[PDB]
Design a protein around this ligand. Structure first.
Ligand SMILES: C=C(C/C=C(/C)CCC=C(C)C)CCC(C)(C)/C=C/CC/C(C)=C\CO[C@H](COP(=O)(O)O[C@H]1O[C@H](C(N)=O)[C@@](C)(O)[C@H](OC(N)=O)[C@H]1O[C@@H]1O[C@H](CO[C@@H]2O[C@H](CO)[C@@H](O)[C@H](O)[C@H]2O)[C@@H](O[C@@H]2O[C@H](C)[C@@H](O[C@@H]3O[C@H](C(=O)NC4=C(O)C=CC4=O)[C@H](O)[C@H](O)[C@H]3O)[C@H](O)[C@H]2NC(C)=O)[C@H](O)[C@H]1NC(C)=O)C(=O)O
Ligand SMILES: *C(=O)N1C[C@H](NOS(=O)(=O)O)CC[C@H]1C(=O)NO[C@H]1CCNC1
Length: 697
């Protein structure tokens, strides 16, 4: 003939159907790991407000409305909130939409009701915000969604504009781009092998998770799902039509139709797509003119290349330690972190506004800052700020900046003393006179009080000593207990052993830590003496639902509860009438426990603040170690009081442990069985400590 040619293109035909088998049956992409924040459970009589609740919802992608029609929305009432808790695939159970009314009375959430059965919820799951994605070596970022996850609507917006789909599809996942006619043939040929072997229903599952729709550095953003988030901040399913249009309009043009870069060309493309469905039955003139009028593109406005960079450092670090290298191999990995968006916003805000207000107020060139927030009892890390400009960064001062803590070291000592309830109490009289301290060579160490003065009487109760952050008595104290012990306390609060150089000055701050290390130390005390090893990770779950890693309470008794109690109580004095008295004046009803830090020549300032739920380490200083001109620890307090004012802190109600009892002491500081001018908590099962003190006579 020769019709031999037709024998070859057919046997060629079955070779491309044997290639599409290996491709689509199973592994279509190496899907990068998804990173989600904390999964919060709301509960009857939970200690949360309606206002708080708004912020929380709003921080986890929910949108206030007047009347509510799609998932991820909420409407506020005078004592209640109605909301549609979005479908989410929780490790504990997959779940769907749920319409629920949260009802409030005071500080507590009273009930939580399903609005289809008017039945209560014992507990109610709130889906975690998607924080970020990690890249694939490949450098293509998608987010797999079932075809049924896309509204049938968006599909029709897709179709009405683009269907030659099974045609497009193949090229992207299979062939090069615009290399020859030679390939378009391949395409048309494959394009009917596909539409033959795999159903229409499945095709646009594979399509809508392949389409290149945006850019973030050197990784291509592909997939309707992920684009929705990227550009707007909501799942494709919750996309309004103006947004879906932008998406569907962008399928052709992925950079020239980019909104960030060119509004005109982006808007001009969308308003075209808004009229591409007007010929179509779906759109009625009344709608079209309105949608086009509604400026479709929701601008943060940011590129959002590397989100939560500081926090992620830790996460990435924690993936490595608990799962080695063989995470990257795996596809469709779901990683659940301890991250807290409300705490984070509050943190980032508090930096961004705090720092310039402290340069301006004090007239500075540079002033950097770091904030680390972790669960009082769990150690779970809820927020982390590495610098004054925390959105965009490569240096994380929460984790890398190792700066002497100065004062941030005083309670190690007191807790050490206060662990001995037979000998040291809060009313124990420490000496407040001039010290001199020969070392091997050459000097004689002679630490002065902050004010360079000394207590008229020659002494000070231990309770006031710490409250005031008085140095002299603190060295007198430590040098009586001995540096090895003060060092043992540091080891047990969980500070990096290599860091402790047990020499007198450590007592006052010769100790360099990173905010996160200090976060650990003060956690251990905040929890009443259980050290809980900090972490970012709640779990790591595979695509086939399968647990690769799960965290579990690994907390450890580090110091006596009574000792932590007493020490913590004292740090409530620190904030109420001592070194942090300025916060205590602002938030008296918090009864915050905390402690101030100041290095010499004001290079570093700390504040360390415990409320009923968190511990918040706040550091402020200069990268170049120069003086900060910031008199006192206030500098970093001014950030902390910013932070507290951004979120809704939990007031600190210390529950005294066993063998605590409030006793009276006289002006001379000896206990009294009735009366006394000053009531102090004491570690005794039997408080006749006082009788035996009263026999002084
Ligand atoms: O024709 C095609 C062959 O050429 P293609 O480029 O495959 O297809 C384009 O032309 C088709 C046609 N028949 O005319 C088309 C109109 O049907 C295609 O549109 C549809 N329906 O698919 C059209 O391609 C689409 O539109 C853009 C291509 O158009 C560009 O501008 C002109 C459009 O007419 C063409 O003359 C040019 O040849 C073409 O370059 C695709 O968007 C592109 O998407 C790419 C991924 C972008 O490059 C990325 O840039 C990144 C970056 O950092 N920068 C990455 O690093 C990396 O370089 C890369 O991933 C790239 O920046 C981006 N282009 C622009 C300007 O929007 C976009 O990804 C692509 N859609 C697909 C296939 O998923 C055919 O018939 O076979
Ligand atoms: C606290 O940092 N202190 C105690 C004194 N008052 O500060 S306070 O507001 O925090 O109560 C003053 C000195 C300071 C301290 O110990 N500073 O020395 C540091 C400098 C570097 N090595 C130790």
């Amino acid at each position: 003939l020769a019709i031999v040619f037709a024998v070859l293109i057919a046997i060629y035909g079955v070779y491309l159907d044997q290639k599409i088998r290996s491709r689509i049956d199973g592994k279509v992409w190496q899907l990068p790991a998804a990173v989600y924040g904390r999964m919060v459970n709301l509960e009857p009589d939970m200690t949360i407000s309606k206002n708080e609740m708004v912020k929380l919802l709003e921080a986890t992608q929910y949108r206030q409305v007047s009347k509510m029609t799609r998932p991820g929305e909420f409407t506020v009432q005078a004592n209640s909130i109605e909301m549609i808790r979005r479908p989410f695939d929780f490790p504990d159970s997959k779940e769907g939409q749920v319409r629920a009314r949260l009802t409030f009375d005071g500080d507590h959430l009273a009930t939580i009701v399903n609005m289809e059965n008017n039945r209560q919820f014992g507990f109610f799951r709130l889906d975690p915000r998607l924080i970020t994605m990690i890249s694939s070596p490949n450098g293509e970022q998608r987010l797999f969604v079932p075809r049924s996850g896309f509204p049938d609507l968006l599909v029709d917006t897709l179709l009405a504009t683009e269907d030659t789909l099974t045609q497009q599809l193949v090229k992207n996942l299979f062939l090069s781009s615009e290399r020859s006619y030679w390939r378009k043939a391949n395409e048309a040929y494959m394009a009917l092998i596909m539409d033959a072997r795999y159903s229409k229903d499945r095709i646009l599952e594979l399509y809508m998770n392949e389409v290149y729709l945006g850019q973030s550095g050197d990784n291509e953003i592909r997939g309707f799902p992920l684009a929705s988030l990227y550009y707007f901040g909501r799942p494709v399913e919750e996309l309004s039509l103006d947004q879906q249009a932008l998406l569907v309009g962008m399928v052709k043009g992925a950079s020239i139709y980019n909104p960030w870069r060119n509004p005109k060309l982006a808007l001009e493309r969308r308003n075209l797509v808004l009229r591409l469905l007007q010929q179509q039955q779906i759109i009625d003139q009344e709608l079209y003119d309105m949608l086009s009028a509604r400026p479709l593109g929701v601008q943060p406005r940011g590129g959002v290349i590397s989100p939560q960079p500081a926090f992620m450092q830790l996460v990435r670090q924690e993936l490595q330690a608990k799962l080695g290298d063989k995470v990257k191999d795996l596809s469709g990995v779901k990683i659940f972190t301890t991250f807290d968006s409300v705490a984070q916003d509050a943190a980032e805000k508090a930096a961004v506004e705090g720092i310039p207000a402290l340069k301006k107020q004090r007239k500075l060139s540079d002033l950097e800052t770091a904030i680390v927030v972790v669960d009082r009892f769990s150690g779970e890390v809820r927020a982390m700020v590495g610098g004054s400009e925390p959105q965009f960064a490569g240096y994380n001062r929460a984790m890398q900046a190792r700066r002497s803590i100065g004062s941030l070291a005083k309670p190690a000592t007191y807790l050490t003393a206060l662990s001995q309830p037979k000998i040291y109490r809060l009313n124990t009289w420490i000496a407040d006179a001039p010290i001199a301290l020969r070392q091997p060579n050459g000097q004689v160490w002679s630490p002065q009080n902050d004010d360079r003065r000394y207590s008229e009487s020659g002494r000070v109760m231990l309770v006031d000593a710490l409250t005031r952050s008085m140095n002299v008595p603190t060295v007198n104290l430590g040098m009586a207990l001995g540096l090895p012990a003060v060092t043992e306390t540091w080891i047990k609060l969980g500070v990096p052993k290599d860091q402790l150089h047990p020499v007198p000055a450590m007592l006052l701050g010769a100790l360099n830590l990173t905010p996160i290390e200090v976060a650990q130390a003060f956690q251990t005390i905040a929890s009443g003496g259980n050290r809980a090893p900090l972490s970012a990770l709640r779990s790591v779950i595979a695509e086939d639902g399968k647990v690769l890693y799960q965290s579990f309470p690994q907390a450890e008794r580090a110091v006596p509860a009574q000792a932590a109690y007493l020490t913590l109580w004292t740090m409530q004095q620190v904030v109420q009438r001592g070194t942090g008295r300025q916060l205590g004046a602002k938030y008296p009803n918090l009864h915050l426990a905390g402690k101030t830090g100041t290095t010499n020549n004001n290079v570093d300032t700390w504040f360390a603040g415990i409320d009923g739920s968190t511990v918040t380490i706040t550091w402020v200083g200069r990268d170049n170690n120069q003086p900060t001109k910031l008199y006192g620890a206030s500098g970093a307090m001014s950030i902390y009081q910013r932070y507290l004012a951004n979120q809704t802190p939990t007031p600190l109600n210390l529950v005294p442990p066993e063998d605590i009892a409030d006793m009276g002491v006289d002006y001379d500081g000896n206990f009294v069985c009735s009366g006394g001018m000053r009531i102090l908590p004491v570690w005794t099962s039997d408080p006749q400590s006082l009788c035996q003190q009263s026999e002084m006579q």
